[PDB]
Scaffold this active site. Structure first.
Site, PDB file in Angstrom:
ATOM      1  N   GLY A  15       0.919  -1.329   0.290  1.00  0.00           N
ATOM      2  CA  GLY A  15      -0.264   0.009  -0.466  1.00  0.00           C
ATOM      3  C   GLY A  15       0.936   0.887   0.619  1.00  0.00           C
ATOM      4  N   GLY A  16      -0.042   2.019   0.831  1.00  0.00           N
ATOM      5  CA  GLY A  16       1.001   3.667   0.413  1.00  0.00           C
ATOM      6  C   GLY A  16       2.767   3.430   1.445  1.00  0.00           C
ATOM      7  N   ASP A  96      -2.489  -7.662  12.920  1.00  0.00           N
ATOM      8  CA  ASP A  96      -2.660  -6.103  14.103  1.00  0.00           C
ATOM      9  C   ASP A  96      -3.498  -5.737  14.855  1.00  0.00           C
ATOM     10  OD1 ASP A  96      -4.112  -5.949  11.099  1.00  0.00           O
ATOM     11  OD2 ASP A  96      -1.755  -5.405  10.068  1.00  0.00           O
ATOM     12  N   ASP A 135       0.555   8.683  11.994  1.00  0.00           N
ATOM     13  CA  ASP A 135      -0.144   7.530  11.547  1.00  0.00           C
ATOM     14  C   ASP A 135      -0.369   6.742  12.885  1.00  0.00           C
ATOM     15  OD1 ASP A 135      -1.738   7.019   9.685  1.00  0.00           O
ATOM     16  OD2 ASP A 135       0.225   5.829   8.425  1.00  0.00           O
TER      17      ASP A 135
HETATM   18  C1  LIG Z   1       2.495 -10.248   9.576  1.00  0.00           C
HETATM   19  C2  LIG Z   1       2.363  -9.356  10.862  1.00  0.00           C
HETATM   20  C3  LIG Z   1       1.136  -8.702  10.872  1.00  0.00           C
HETATM   21  O1  LIG Z   1       2.623  -7.923   9.491  1.00  0.00           O
HETATM   22  C4  LIG Z   1       3.640  -6.979  10.044  1.00  0.00           C
HETATM   23  C5  LIG Z   1       4.772  -7.612  11.120  1.00  0.00           C
HETATM   24  C6  LIG Z   1       5.805  -6.742  10.968  1.00  0.00           C
HETATM   25  C7  LIG Z   1       6.637  -6.025   9.930  1.00  0.00           C
HETATM   26  C8  LIG Z   1       5.051  -5.495   9.110  1.00  0.00           C
HETATM   27  C9  LIG Z   1       5.096  -4.236   8.450  1.00  0.00           C
HETATM   28  C10 LIG Z   1       5.957  -3.111   9.126  1.00  0.00           C
HETATM   29  S1  LIG Z   1       6.952  -2.484   9.839  1.00  0.00           S
HETATM   30  C11 LIG Z   1       7.318  -0.816  10.015  1.00  0.00           C
HETATM   31  O2  LIG Z   1       7.755  -0.073  10.438  1.00  0.00           O
HETATM   32  N1  LIG Z   1       6.869  -0.385   8.495  1.00  0.00           N
HETATM   33  C12 LIG Z   1       5.448  -1.833   8.020  1.00  0.00           C
HETATM   34  O3  LIG Z   1       5.292  -1.395   6.610  1.00  0.00           O
HETATM   35  C13 LIG Z   1       4.135  -6.449   9.177  1.00  0.00           C
HETATM   36  N2  LIG Z   1       2.926  -5.163   8.134  1.00  0.00           N
HETATM   37  C14 LIG Z   1       2.870  -5.764   6.821  1.00  0.00           C
HETATM   38  C15 LIG Z   1       1.913  -5.135   5.979  1.00  0.00           C
HETATM   39  C16 LIG Z   1       0.828  -4.862   6.592  1.00  0.00           C
HETATM   40  C17 LIG Z   1       0.790  -4.188   8.256  1.00  0.00           C
HETATM   41  N3  LIG Z   1      -0.566  -4.112   8.586  1.00  0.00           N
HETATM   42  C18 LIG Z   1       2.222  -4.830   8.823  1.00  0.00           C
END
Ligand SMILES: CC(C)Oc1cccc(/C=C2\SC(=O)NC2=O)c1N1CCC[C@@H](N)C1
Length: 273
Positions: A15-16, A96, A135
């Site tokens: 995404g963004g 999340d 954010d």
């Molecule tokens: C698999 C788990 C639920 O998700 C994640 C685990 C560890 C890191 C990230 C993402 C990170 S860390 C940071 O500073 N910026 C990020 O974009 C992540 N994301 C995946 C994409 C969707 C997001 N909401 C959660």
């Protein structure tokens, strides 16, 4: 290089913020997240204590870097011809907060209190480090399911914390304050408190309180779920139309609704079992 050091797994999201992949650090099998950010999409740039030109996101992550588990830890970073690659920690199992609330609906107040307290401690850590997140929202909060510990992530819309007015914003509109909507001006701390009010409402109601700009400006808070009077009072205080009427982080943490918070491990045992 980057390719030899990390085993790339599935795409976790895009995404963004860019594209994020699951990964494993080849040396010690450490679970990691691999975040790709394209150069042409980076508007804010900064400098490291050494003087290298890196995205502001990297500068902010390094400033907040510590053993404190409430904020994501940047493990490494790499520059490519058209992008930056960030290696971040990845709790396992994890979910999340957006997915958690989507799946479970409105949270029990005891759970919301534990989660909200941990977010407050994470935001105070950012502010103490001279970083404004900009954010704060359910999608930018990870839940470490085994430990009951929350992590604030994604500094891609952030800025260095300052006491003067901000006239730029690229965070989430529905979490942005009425002074930003009306005047395109906000102060860091009071805008952060507004977003915390949106987040707390989201935790206890299972959805955000406002959809349109008109709703944000009016600031009339309607509770669609049964919420305690103390919790409603705290939410309405964080959502005060006048930024100077909003509580400070200390006043939020001293509020009667915030008393007797569970420990993260007690939270995991009771609610994340
Ligand atoms: C698999 C788990 C639920 O998700 C994640 C685990 C560890 C890191 C990230 C993402 C990170 S860390 C940071 O500073 N910026 C990020 O974009 C992540 N994301 C995946 C994409 C969707 C997001 N909401 C959660």
């Amino acid at each position: 290089p980057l390719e030899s050091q990390y085993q790339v797994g599935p795409l976790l999201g895009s995404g963004g913020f860019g594209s994020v992949y699951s990964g494993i650090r080849v040396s010690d099998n450490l679970p990691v997240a691999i975040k790709h950010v394209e150069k042409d999409r980076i508007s804010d740039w900064g400098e490291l204590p050494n003087g290298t030109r890196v995205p502001m996101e990297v500068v902010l992550l390094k400033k907040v870097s510590s053993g404190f588990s409430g904020v994501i830890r940047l493990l490494d970073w790499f520059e490519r011809p058209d992008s930056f690659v960030l290696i971040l920690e990845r709790p396992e199992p994890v979910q999340d907060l957006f997915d958690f609330i989507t799946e479970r609906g409105a949270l029990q107040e005891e759970l919301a209190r534990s989660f909200f307290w941990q977010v407050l401690e994470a935001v105070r850590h950012c502010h103490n480090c001279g970083v404004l997140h900009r954010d704060i929202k359910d999608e930018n909060i990870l839940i470490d399911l085994n430990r009951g510990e929350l992590k604030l992530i994604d500094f891609g819309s952030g800025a260095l914390l300052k006491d003067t007015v901000y006239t730029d914003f690229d965070g989430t509109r529905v979490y942005s304050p009425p002074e930003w909507i009306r005047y395109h001006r906000y102060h860091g701390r009071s805008a952060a408190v507004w977003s915390l009010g949106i987040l707390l409402y989201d935790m206890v109601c299972g959805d955000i309180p406002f959809e349109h700009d008109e709703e944000i400006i009016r600031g009339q808070v309607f509770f669609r779920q049964r919420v305690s009077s103390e919790c409603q009072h705290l939410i309405r205080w964080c959502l005060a139309l006048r930024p100077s009427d909003r509580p400070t982080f200390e006043e939020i943490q001293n509020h009667p609704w915030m008393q007797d918070v569970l420990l993260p491990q007690e939270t995991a045992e009771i609610h994340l079992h």
